């Protein structure tokens, strides 16, 4: 077959260089970008049906996720209404449904509970004033999140979601599922548990819940358990029996309607002392400027909430964009969601993002442009102004059970954890660390710790690389580790070391140790012994994988070269990239008799050059 034949001079870097010479309508994305390009002829019907369906779903979803936040039921309607309208303008994706997404809602509610506890606020009981303070805190947090997202989009840093690795995303998702399960379990049991804010909070809440389980409201518990059973049964049947009925069954909406029907008919609120929403505001409240003085106590939480919400939004947007063959602007997504959160925070809402289930409902029933979003917002509006009284008898345990039923996919990742461990240990370590940190910490603090641990794992993987002592395959130019192939011959008096990493400070000490181990000695000690009195003659450093190089790395390389030259041992560098050589020359490496003549193109020119002497 084909043969590898090449005849050329032995090029050093100096010789190679001698012979071959070197050397305005986007930030505010218009609705006019697609409204003139609309398809009113046929798209109107699909948009209307899709919007009605996703609005029916999203009213219930926002109502339920308002419990995840520490705000009274009714402000979830505002959170499902306002951001959709103000994302219809600046939004790039045309399939996602803007809403609470209970993970972000639970982060917001954790912040609100921390900044407005039951005992710290009410000393009389002042439900109304406490709810007002909680709403103000949620609005302030939403405004801060929107400001942060707008700043990030303006700075065009949309790649920060790359740092949200799949393992840490999965671990954070499982931990958030556990936290949401604990919160909604507190809600369904109708048990009055004091809120624990800080570290180990979830386990303290579980301890108090299992201590107060004797005070469980039987009616609420049965309602929640039946809602969960019905929802998961219908979801499993849809997953199995999927060839027919392509549109997923909106079981949650029907379950809520029926449960509200019985709650009104038999009046569980008075007869069985059930925990119902009991209050829904009618009409739209006037906008109120949040107190910016609280921004200092929300920074570490607003940052994490913004990052998580934007990551979820872009994830769903990309999932549907690759399906419908279009591209979403990440920085414009940041702009759209930052403006959305600012607008919603001004109008008394908590942080808004997209939800995979709501987006799936919107798309599967005739998914088209964001006009479906406007229709869903209109449905939420008529729910706010008209259907508010009808939803009063509905129990909160039903909403909490709906969220718990939806938690299955989030809980499912512990099954793929062991496969992650079998494939790559560090990825499973990142997963488990993110899960544990987000459990025994805040979800915001857990996310920050998971990101930080991902950075640390990258640094450690770069800092402790694979290094080999290379030898030549006979009659070829192929050099492999001598201990791996058993047909590898060690060259005469010359050791070849491959350090498969960029050289920085941690790598500097690692590389010094690796060279000392490979050559079998250290230049300092032998030089000192020879001075007091008064096996290897060449060391080739295979630097093909040396990506970057810092001042500490250049200083270490110079020190190694000088130390080995002091004992009449020549150090040669091979396979160094052009940019690394530029870094060496601009870091002052080529001073004091270096002259770039000890640099070769591959580790075969070095060996041939040594054989020439």
Ligand X SMILES: CCCCCCCCCCC(CCCCCCCCCC)(CO[C@@H]1O[C@H](CO)[C@@H](O[C@H]2O[C@H](CO)[C@@H](O)[C@H](O)[C@H]2O)[C@H](O)[C@H]1O)CO[C@@H]1O[C@H](CO)[C@@H](O[C@H]2O[C@H](CO)[C@@H](O)[C@H](O)[C@H]2O)[C@H](O)[C@H]1O
Ligand Y SMILES: CC(C)CCC[C@@H](C)[C@H]1CC[C@H]2[C@@H]3CC=C4C[C@@H](O)CC[C@]4(C)[C@H]3CC[C@]12C
Ligand Z SMILES: CCCCCCCC/C=C\CCCCCCCC(=O)O[C@H](COC(=O)CCCCCCCCCCCCCCC)COP(=O)([O-])OCC[N+](C)(C)C
Residue 1 CB, nearest distance to its own copies (Å)? 7
Nearest distance in Å: CB 579, ligand Z = 10
Minimum CB–partner distance for residue 26 and ligand Z (Å)? 25
Closer of 442 and 471 to ligand X (Cβ): 442
Residue 219 touching ligand Y (CB under 6 A): yes
Site for its own copies in 452-481 (CB under 8 A): 452, 455-456, 458-459, 461-463, 465-466, 473, 475-478, 480-481
Look at residues 410, 404, 402 and name the one whose alpha carbon lies nearest to residue 175: 410
**Which residue, 565, 571, 567, is CA-closest to 606?**
571
Task: State the nearest-atom distance from the C-beta of 292 to ligand Y, in Å.
Answer: 12
Contact stretch for ligand Y (CB under 6 A) within 378-386, 436-444, 496-504, 574-582? 436-444
- Assess 24 for contact with ligand Y (CB under 6 A): no
- Helix, strand, or coil here: 34? coil
Q: Which stretch binds ligand Y (CB under 6 A): 138-146, 403-411, 536-544, 563-571?
A: 403-411
Q: At what angle do helices 43-68 and 371-385 cross, to 10 degrees?
A: 50
404 contacts ligand Y (rule: CB under 6 A)? yes
Dist CA 150 CA 408 (whole Å): 33
Kindly tell me which residue out of 85, 150, 306, 449 binds ligand Y, with binding defined by CB under 6 A. Answer: 449
Site residues (CB under 8 A) for its own copies, limited to 155-174: 159, 162-167
111 binds ligand X (CB under 6 A): yes
- Both tokens of 406, joined, read 């939806």
Q: Looking at 238, 357, 426, 565, which residue binds its own copies (CB under 8 A)?
A: 426
183 vs 173: CA distance, rounded Å: 15
Nearest distance, CB of residue 128 and ligand Z, angstroms = 44
* β-pairing verdict for 494-499 and 479-481: unpaired
Nearest Cα to 220, choosing from 241, 254, 191, 180?
A: 191
487 is an interface residue for its own copies by CB under 8 A: yes
Say whether residue 301 binds ligand X (CB under 6 A).
yes
d(CA 398, CA 233): 16
Q: Does 117 bind ligand X (CB under 6 A)?
A: no
Q: Helix (H, G, I), strand (E, B), or coil: what is residue 63?
A: helix
Look up tokens 């060496």; give the residue.
Answer: 584
- The correct pick among 384, 417, 447, 546 for binding ligand Y (CB under 6 A) is 417
If you ran DSSP here, which 8-state letter would residue 464 be given?
S
Residue ranges with strand state E in 251-383: 353-354
Q: Scan residues 425-484 and list those touching ligand X (CB under 6 A).
A: 442, 444-445, 448-449, 452
Q: What is the distance, to the nearest Å, from the Cα of residue 248 to the centroid of all Cα atoms in its chain?
A: 28
Element at 322 (helix H, strand E): helix 299-324
Could you count the other beta carbons within 10 Å of the beta carbon of residue 118?
13
Least Å distance between CB 200 and ligand Y? Answer: 7
Considering beta carbons, is residue 385 or 460 the nearer one to ligand Y? 460
Residue 197, binding choice from ligand X, ligand Y, its own copies, none, Cβ under 5 to 8 Å by partner class: ligand X
* In the complex, minimum distance from the CB of residue 548 to ligand Z, in angstroms, rounded to a whole number: 9
Using rule CB under 6 A, residue 245 touches ligand Y? no
Rounded to 5 degrees, φ, ψ at 416 are -90, -5
Phi-psi domain of 28 (left: phi exceeds 0; alpha: psi -120 through 50; beta: other): beta
**Dihedral angle at the C-alpha atoms of 57, 59, 60, 62, nearest 10 degrees?**
110
Three-state SS at 499? strand
Q: Residue 415: which of its own copies, ligand Y, ligand Z, none does it interact with, CB under 5 to 8 A by kind?
A: ligand Y
- Asked whether position 307 contacts ligand Y by CB under 6 A, the answer is no
Q: What is the dihedral of CA 436, 438, 442, 447, to 10 degrees?
A: 140
Q: Which residues contact 7 (CB under 8 A, 6 or more apart)?
A: none
| Residue 611 touching its own copies (CB under 8 A) | yes
Q: CB of residue 165 vs ligand Z: minimum separation in angstroms?
A: 13
Asked whether 165 and 430 are in contact (CB, 8 A), the reply is yes
Helix 102-115 with 43-68: angle, nearest 10 deg: 30
Task: Specify the stretch interacting with ligand X by CB under 6 A; choose among 184-192, 196-204, 252-260, 536-544.
Answer: 196-204
Between 43 and 163, whose beta carbon lies closer to its own copies?
Answer: 163
Q: Which residue's CB is nearer to ligand Z, number 35 or number 460?
A: 460
Give the residues lining the site for ligand X (CB under 6 A): 111, 114, 197-199, 296-297, 299-301, 303, 442, 444-445, 448-449, 452
Give the residues lining the site for ligand Y (CB under 6 A): 174, 178, 181, 185, 199, 202, 218-219, 222-223, 226-228, 230, 255, 258-259, 262-263, 268, 296, 299, 404, 407-408, 411, 414-415, 417-418, 432, 435-436, 439-440, 449, 452-453, 456
């Amino acid at each position: 077959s084909c043969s590898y034949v090449v005849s050329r001079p032995v090029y050093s870097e100096l010789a190679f260089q001698q012979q071959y010479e070197r050397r305005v309508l986007k930030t505010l994305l218009p609705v006019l970008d697609w409204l003139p390009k609309y398809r009113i002829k046929e798209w109107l019907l699909s948009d209307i049906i899709s919007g009605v369906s996703t609005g029916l779903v999203g009213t219930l979803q926002g109502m339920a996720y308002a419990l995840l936040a520490a705000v009274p039921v009714g402000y979830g309607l505002y959170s499902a209404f306002f951001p959709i309208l103000t994302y219809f303008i600046f939004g790039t994706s045309r399939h996602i449904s803007v809403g609470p997404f209970p993970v972000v809602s639970l982060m917001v509610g954790s912040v609100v509970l921390s900044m407005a506890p039951d005992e710290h606020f009410i000393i009389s009981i002042d439900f109304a004033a406490r709810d007002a303070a909680r709403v103000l805190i949620a609005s302030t947090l939403t405004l801060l999140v929107g400001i942060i997202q707008l700043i990030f989009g303006g700075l065009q840093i949309g790649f920060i979601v790359r740092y949200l690795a799949d393992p840490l995303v999965g671990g954070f998702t499982t931990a958030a599922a556990f936290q949401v399960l604990v919160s909604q379990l507190k809600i369904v049991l109708n048990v009055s548990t004091k809120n624990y804010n800080g570290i180990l909070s979830i386990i303290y809440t579980l301890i108090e819940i299992f201590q107060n389980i004797g005070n469980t409201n039987l009616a609420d518990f049965i309602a929640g358990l039946l809602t969960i059973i019905i929802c998961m049964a219908v979801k499993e049947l849809n997953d199995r029996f999927k060839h027919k009925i392509p549109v997923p069954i909106p079981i949650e909406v029907i379950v809520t309607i029926i449960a509200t029907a019985i709650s009104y008919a038999v009046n569980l609120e008075k007869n069985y002392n059930a925990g119902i929403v009991k209050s829904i505001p009618r009409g739209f409240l006037p906008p109120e400027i949040p107190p910016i003085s609280l921004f200092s106590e929300m920074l570490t939480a607003s940052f994490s909430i913004a990052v998580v919400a934007y990551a979820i939004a872009v994830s769903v947007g990309k999932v549907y964009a690759i399906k419908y063959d279009y591209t979403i602007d990440g920085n414009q997504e940041f702009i759209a969601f930052g403006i959305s959160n600012i607008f919603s925070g001004f109008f008394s809402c908590f942080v808004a993002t997209t939800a995979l289930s709501r987006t799936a409902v919107q798309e599967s029933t005739g998914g088209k442009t964001q006009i479906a979003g406007i229709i869903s917002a209109a449905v939420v509006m008529i729910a706010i102004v008209a259907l508010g009284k009808l939803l009063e008898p509905l129990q909160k345990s039903v909403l909490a059970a709906v969220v718990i039923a939806n938690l299955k996919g989030m809980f499912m990742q512990v099954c793929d954890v062991p496969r992650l461990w079998r494939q790559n240990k560090t990825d499973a370590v990142i997963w488990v660390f993110t899960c544990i940190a987000s459990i025994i910490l805040g979800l915001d603090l857990g996310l920050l710790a998971g990101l930080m641990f991902g950075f640390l794992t990258v640094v450690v993987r770069v800092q402790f690389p694979s290094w080999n002592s290379l030898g030549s395959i006979p009659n070829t130019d192929i050099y492999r580790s001598t201990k791996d192939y058993k047909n590898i011959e060690e060259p005469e008096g010359v050791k070849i070391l491959r350090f498969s990493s960029p050289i920085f400070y941690g790598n500097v000490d690692g590389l010094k140790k690796c060279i000392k181990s490979t050559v079998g000695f250290d230049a300092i000690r032998v030089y000192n012994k020879r001075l007091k009195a008064l096996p290897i003659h060449s060391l080739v450093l295979d630097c093909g994988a040396v990506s970057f190089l810092d001042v500490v790395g250049v200083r270490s390389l110079r020190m190694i070269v000088k130390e080995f030259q002091r004992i009449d041992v020549h150090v040669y560098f091979a396979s160094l990239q052009d940019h690394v050589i530029e870094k060496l020359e601009q870091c002052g490496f080529f001073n004091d008799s270096i002259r770039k003549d000890i640099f070769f193109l591959t580790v075969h020119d070095a060996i041939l050059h040594l054989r020439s002497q």
